[PDB]
Write a protein that binds this ligand. Sequence first.
Ligand code: QBN
Ligand code: QBN
Ligand code: QBN
Ligand code: QBN
Ligand code: QBN
Ligand code: QBN
Ligand code: QBN
Ligand code: QBN
Ligand code: 2CV
Ligand code: 2CV
Ligand code: 2CV
Ligand code: 2CV
Ligand code: NA
Ligand code: NA
Ligand code: NA
Lengths: 271, 271, 271, 271
Amino acid sequence: SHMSRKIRDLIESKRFQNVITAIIVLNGAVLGLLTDTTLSASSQNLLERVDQLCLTIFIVEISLKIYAYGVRGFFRSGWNLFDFVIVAIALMPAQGSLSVLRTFRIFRVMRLVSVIPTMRRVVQGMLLALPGVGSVAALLTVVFYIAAVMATNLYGATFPEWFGDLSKSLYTLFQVMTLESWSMGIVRPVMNVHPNAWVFFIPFIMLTTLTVLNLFIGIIVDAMAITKEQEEEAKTGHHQEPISQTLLHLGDRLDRIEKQLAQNNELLQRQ
Amino acid sequence: SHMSRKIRDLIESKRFQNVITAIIVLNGAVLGLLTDTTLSASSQNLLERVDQLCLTIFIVEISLKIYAYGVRGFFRSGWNLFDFVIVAIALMPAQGSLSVLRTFRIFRVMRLVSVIPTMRRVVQGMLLALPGVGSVAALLTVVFYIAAVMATNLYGATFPEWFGDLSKSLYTLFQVMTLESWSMGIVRPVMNVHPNAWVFFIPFIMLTTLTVLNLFIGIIVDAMAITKEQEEEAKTGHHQEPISQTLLHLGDRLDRIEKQLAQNNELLQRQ
Amino acid sequence: SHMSRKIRDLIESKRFQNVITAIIVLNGAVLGLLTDTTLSASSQNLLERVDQLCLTIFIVEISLKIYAYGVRGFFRSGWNLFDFVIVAIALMPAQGSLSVLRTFRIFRVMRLVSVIPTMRRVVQGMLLALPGVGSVAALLTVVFYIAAVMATNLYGATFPEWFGDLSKSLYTLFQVMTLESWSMGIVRPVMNVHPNAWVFFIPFIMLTTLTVLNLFIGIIVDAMAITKEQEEEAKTGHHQEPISQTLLHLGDRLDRIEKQLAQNNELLQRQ
Amino acid sequence: SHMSRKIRDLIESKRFQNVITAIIVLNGAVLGLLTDTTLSASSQNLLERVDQLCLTIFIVEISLKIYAYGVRGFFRSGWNLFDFVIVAIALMPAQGSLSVLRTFRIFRVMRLVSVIPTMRRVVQGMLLALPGVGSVAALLTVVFYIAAVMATNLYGATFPEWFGDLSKSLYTLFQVMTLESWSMGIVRPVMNVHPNAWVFFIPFIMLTTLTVLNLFIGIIVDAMAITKEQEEEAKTGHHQEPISQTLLHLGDRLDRIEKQLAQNNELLQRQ
Ligand SMILES: CC/C(=C(\c1ccccc1)c1ccc(OCCNC)cc1)c1ccccc1
Ligand SMILES: CC/C(=C(\c1ccccc1)c1ccc(OCCNC)cc1)c1ccccc1
Ligand SMILES: CC/C(=C(\c1ccccc1)c1ccc(OCCNC)cc1)c1ccccc1
Ligand SMILES: CC/C(=C(\c1ccccc1)c1ccc(OCCNC)cc1)c1ccccc1
Ligand SMILES: CC/C(=C(\c1ccccc1)c1ccc(OCCNC)cc1)c1ccccc1
Ligand SMILES: CC/C(=C(\c1ccccc1)c1ccc(OCCNC)cc1)c1ccccc1
Ligand SMILES: CC/C(=C(\c1ccccc1)c1ccc(OCCNC)cc1)c1ccccc1
Ligand SMILES: CC/C(=C(\c1ccccc1)c1ccc(OCCNC)cc1)c1ccccc1
Ligand SMILES: CCCCCCCCCC(=O)N(CCO)C[C@@H](O)[C@@H](O)[C@@H](O)[C@@H](O)CO
Ligand SMILES: CCCCCCCCCC(=O)N(CCO)C[C@@H](O)[C@@H](O)[C@@H](O)[C@@H](O)CO
Ligand SMILES: CCCCCCCCCC(=O)N(CCO)C[C@@H](O)[C@@H](O)[C@@H](O)[C@@H](O)CO
Ligand SMILES: CCCCCCCCCC(=O)N(CCO)C[C@@H](O)[C@@H](O)[C@@H](O)[C@@H](O)CO
Ligand code: NA
Ligand code: NA
Ligand code: NA
C-alpha cells in the first residue's frame, strides 16, 4: 500500500531519527532529575508525565515500524527487537519472573546506541567479537572455579569473611584479580595464619591477569577489524575477505605469481 | 615587501626556535620557583619581572609572525592560534567568563609542544585520533550515566557520601572504574546493607574497563599510524594511502595480478 | 585386532567426549558442594561415592585409550599424559615427595581443557608462546633478584616486616610491582626513615611494569598468531609460513617480481 | 701474534661463556647470602673471599679481552664497555662523585644480560626503542611539571604533606598516575577542603594514563620489531627493510606491478 511506503521513508529520515534521539535524551534527563528526592511533589509528578509522554512516543514509533515493515520484517532485525522489548516491558503488570522490580527506566537511554548508527556499529563490532573469545572466557571460568574451591577449603575456616563459602571466595578472588588491596588487605592478613599462602595467590594473580588481558585484547582487536571490514562492505557492497585470511595466504599468493612470472619468462626467452 | 621576507626567514630559523625554547624553559623555571613561599620579597618581585620579560618576548615573537604572514595567514594554523591565545589571554583585566582566576601561568610551558616540531607532531597525531574514537567515548558516557542514575537510586539513601546525588555517583563510579579501593572501600561496605550489590558493580567494572581499554588502544593505534603516514607525506610530498585501506584491498590487488598473469600466459601459450 | 579398531572410534566419537565432559562437570560440582561443612554426614558420604564413581569412569576411559592406541602411542600425546597423571595420582598412598597433601581433587576440572578441543587449542597456543618469551621472563627475574638484595640491605633493618630478609623482600617487591598500596602503604612509611627511598622505588616500578607488560604482550600476540596458523594447517593440511616470516620477506618478494616484470618488458619491447 | 689469535677463540667459546655465567651466578648467590645478618663472622668472612675470587676472575676475563681485541677494538662494543665499568668501578678508593657509597655489588648480576646473548638481544631491542619514544616521554614530562606547579599552588598550603613543595607534588602525582589510593587516600581528603579538586585530578589521570600507555606500547611494539629484524640480518647477513617502510610502500609497489602487467598485455594483444 501507499501508506506503508510513505511511512517507511518517514521512519528512514534523518530528522525522524533526530526527533527520536531528542526524545531519548529528554527521557534520560527527566529520569536523572527524578533521583533528586529534595524536589517538590509538584515537580515529581510533572517529570513522571514527561516520562509517560516519552514512552508513548516510543509506542507510536515502534508501532509505525511494525506496520510499515511487517511483523516478519521488523522482528528480522536484532536492533529492532531490542527497541521493541525496551518499550514492551514498560507496559507490564508484574510478569512471572524472579526479578525484584523493573525500576530500571534509565535502561531506555540504551536506545541511543541503536538509534545512533555510529554507536550501533561500534557496539555491533563488540558483540560479533564475543563468540571468538569464548574459549578464553571459558578457560578463565575454569581457573576461578578451581581457585574458589581451593581457597574455601584452605582458608574459609580461619578467614570466613572472605572465604566463608564458595560464593564469598569467588568475590574475594575477583578482587584479588583486580589487584584491589590483594596484599595489604587479603594475602598479608591470611599469611599470618598460613605462612605460605603466597604460593596459592601469586600464581592466581599471574594466571588470571594474563588470561583477562588475552580475553580483552582478543575482543578489542577482532572488534576493530570487524568494524573496518563491515564499513568496506557497506561502502562497496562487495564481500570483504577478513584480514587474517589475507595474511595467511599472502605468502602463497606471492610465490604463485613468482612462478607464474618465471614460467612466462621461460616461454619468452625460448621463441 | 623586503621587511616581511627577511622577518619570515628569521622566524623560520633553528636559532630563533632555540631562543624561543630557552625563553619558555626560563619562564617555566621562574614560575616553578614562585611556588616557594619561603622566598624573600626581593626574590619574589625579581622573578615576577623575569615573568613579564618572558611574556613581552612572546608578544614580540607573535607580532613579528602576524606581520610577516598576515592575519589571514597566521590564523590559518591551529598551532599559531594556540600560541596567540596563550599570550593574548595574559593581557586581560577580568574577562566576562565563569572562571575563578587566570593564575595558570604555567600553561605557558604548553608552548614547548608547539615550538618543538617533534612534540608538535606527536600531539598532532593524538588530536587527529580523537574523532575516530568518538563513538566509543560516547558509549562510555552512556554507560556511566545509566550507572550513575542506577547507583543513586539504589544506594544514595543508605550511602549518601558516595551516592548521595548524581554528581557524587559519577565520581564514585569513576573511582570504581579505576579499581581504586572499589571493594575494601566501596562495594564491601555497601554489601553489608545490600547483600547483592556485586550484581551491579562487577558487571560495571567488566564493561567500563573493556570500553576504556578499547578507547585507549583505539587512540594509541590510530595516532601511531597517522604519525608515520604524515612523516611519509612530509618526506616524499606524495599522498600516503592509510594502512587500513592498503590492507582491505591487498586481497583484491593480489587476485587482480594473479588473473592478469594467467591471461598473459593464455595469449603466450597459443601463438 | 577388531576390538582395538572399534574401541578407537568409540573414543573418537562426539557423544563419548560429551559423556566424559558431563562426568568432569559432575565431579567438579560434587567437589564444590563438599566445601560446605554445614552438610549432614549422610550427604557428605553420598558425594564422596559420586567422586569415586567419577574417578573410576576416568580409570576405564584412560585404560580403553591405553589399549586401543598402545603405550607407545597413548603416551605420544602431551594431553594424554596429563589426562593419565590426573587420574594416576588419585590412586596413591603417600608418594615420596615434599608435598603437604594431594587434597587438590578440584584439579580434575583441568581435564575440561583437554577434553574440549576449542579450549585445548587455546591453552596449546599459550604453551607454545612461553619459549619465545623466555628471555624477557629471565630479564624480569634478574631485575627482581637485584631489587630484592638492594631492598633487604637498604631497608630490612628499619622495616623488617617488609624487607626483613630476601624472601620477604621478593614478596613486597611483587606487591610494589602490582602497584598494590605501594605508596600509602610501603614507600610513604619507608620515606619517613629514608627520605630518598623514592629514588629506588619509582625506577623499580617503571622498569618492572614495562617488562611485565612486554612479557604479557609477547605471550598474547604470539599465542594469537600460533592459534590461527595451527587452524590453517588443520584445515588445509599444508604447512603455514609464520606471519613474521611472510612480513620480513614481503619487501624482497615484491622487488623480485618488479624486476621480473621489467625484464619481461625488456624482451617484449625489443622483438 | 699467535697468543692473541688463540686467546680470542678461547673467549669466543661456549664453555668460556658458561664458565663466566656460573661465576656471575656464584657471585650473585654469595651477595644474596651476605644480606643475612644472623650469620657467624666465620661465614661472613668466607663469602667476602668468594666475592673477591669472583671479582678477580672478571679482571682476568676483561684483561684477556683487552689484549686479544685491543683497546680500540674492545671499547668499540657498548656491551664490553659496560662489562669493563662493572669491574673497573669495584677497584676504586672513593672517587670524586656525589654518591653515598658503591655498596651495589649486586649490580654485577647485570652482567648476566651481556654474557647471555638471548638476553643481550632482548635488552638491546628495548634500548634501541627509547629514541623513538623520546617525544612522548618529553610530553609526559611537560604534563607532570605543569601539574606539579598547579597542585603546589592550589593545595600545598592546605595539604602540605602531599603538595608541600614542588618535589612533594611530583611524588603525589606519580602516585595518582599509578592510581594508587588516588581517591580514598588523596582526592577525597582534598575535596573536603576544595570541593572541585576532581576538575584538576580526573583529567590529570585521564591524560597521564593515555600518555604512559602510549609511551609503553610504543616501546614494546618497536622493540619487538627491531629484535625480529636484527635476527633476520644476523641469519642472512642482508639488510632488513623495517616493516613500517614495507607497509608504507606496499600500496605503491602493488599499483606499479598492476600497471606493468597491463602495459605488457597492451604490447601482447597488439602484435
Ligand atoms: C571475520 C572476523 C573473524 C575473526 C577475525 C577478526 C579480526 C581479525 C581477523 C580475524 C576471527 C577469526 C578467528 C577467531 O578465532 C576464534 C574462533 N575461531 C573460529 C576469532 C575471530 C571471525 C568472526 C566470526 C567467525 C569467524 C571469524
Ligand atoms: C599480526 C599478528 C596478529 C594476528 C594475525 C596472525 C596471523 C595471521 C593473521 C593475523 C591476529 C589477529 C587477530 C586475532 O584474533 C584473535 C581473536 N581471538 C583470540 C589473532 C591474531 C595480531 C595479534 C594481536 C594483535 C595484533 C595483531
Ligand atoms: C587516515 C587515518 C584514519 C584511520 C586509521 C588510523 C590508523 C590506521 C588505519 C586507519 C581511521 C579509520 C577508521 C576509523 O574508524 C572510526 C571512524 N570511521 C570513519 C578511525 C580511524 C582516519 C582518520 C580520520 C578520518 C578517517 C580515517
Ligand atoms: C591488523 C588488524 C588491525 C586493524 C586492521 C584490520 C583490518 C584492516 C586493516 C587494519 C585495525 C587498525 C586500526 C584500527 O583503528 C581503530 C580506530 N578506532 C577504533 C582498527 C583496526 C589492528 C587492530 C588493533 C591493533 C593492531 C592492528
Ligand atoms: C612460529 C611462531 C613463532 C613466533 C611468532 C609468533 C607469532 C607471530 C610471529 C612469529 C616467534 C618468533 C620469534 C620469537 O622470538 C623469540 C624466540 N626467537 C626464536 C618468538 C616467537 C615461533 C614459535 C616457536 C619457535 C620459533 C618461532
Ligand atoms: C607489525 C609489527 C609486529 C611484529 C612484526 C615485526 C616485524 C616483522 C613481523 C612482525 C611482531 C610480531 C610478533 C612478535 O613476537 C614477539 C614475541 N616475543 C617477544 C614480535 C613482533 C607487532 C608487534 C606487536 C604487536 C603487533 C604487531
Ligand atoms: C628501524 C626501526 C625503527 C622504527 C620502527 C620500529 C618498529 C616497527 C616499525 C618501525 C621507528 C620508526 C619511527 C619512529 O618514530 C619516532 C622517531 N621517528 C624517526 C620510531 C621507531 C627506527 C629505529 C631507529 C630510528 C628510526 C626508525
Ligand atoms: C599496523 C599499524 C601499526 C603501525 C604502522 C602503521 C602504518 C604503517 C606501518 C606500521 C605502527 C608500527 C610501529 C609504530 O611505531 C611507533 C613508535 N613510536 C610511537 C607505529 C605504528 C601498529 C601500531 C600499533 C600496534 C601495532 C601496529
Ligand atoms: C567472575 C567472578 C564472579 C564472582 C561472583 C561473586 C560471588 C557472588 C555471590 C555474592 O557475592 N553474594 C551472594 C550471597 O548472598 C553476596 C556477598 O555479600 C558475599 O558473597 C560476600 O562477598 C560477603 O557478604 C562475605 O564477606
Ligand atoms: C567521566 C566521569 C565524570 C565524573 C564526574 C564527577 C562528578 C563531578 C561533581 C563533583 O564531584 N563535585 C561537584 C559538586 O560540588 C564535588 C564532589 O565533592 C562531590 O561530587 C562528591 O565527590 C563528594 O563531595 C561527596 O562525598
Ligand atoms: C616473582 C616474585 C616471587 C616472589 C616470592 C615471594 C617470597 C616467597 C617467600 C614467602 O613469602 N614466605 C616464605 C617464608 O616462610 C612467607 C611470607 O610470609 C614472608 O616472606 C613475608 O611475606 C611475611 O611473612 C613477612 O612480613
Ligand atoms: C616522573 C615523576 C618524578 C617524581 C619525582 C618525585 C619527587 C622526588 C623528591 C622527593 O620525593 N624527595 C626529595 C626531598 O628530600 C623526598 C620525599 O620524601 C618528599 O618529596 C615527599 O614525598 C614527602 O617526604 C612529603 O610527604
Ligand atoms: Na590498582
Ligand atoms: Na588501599
Ligand atoms: Na589500591
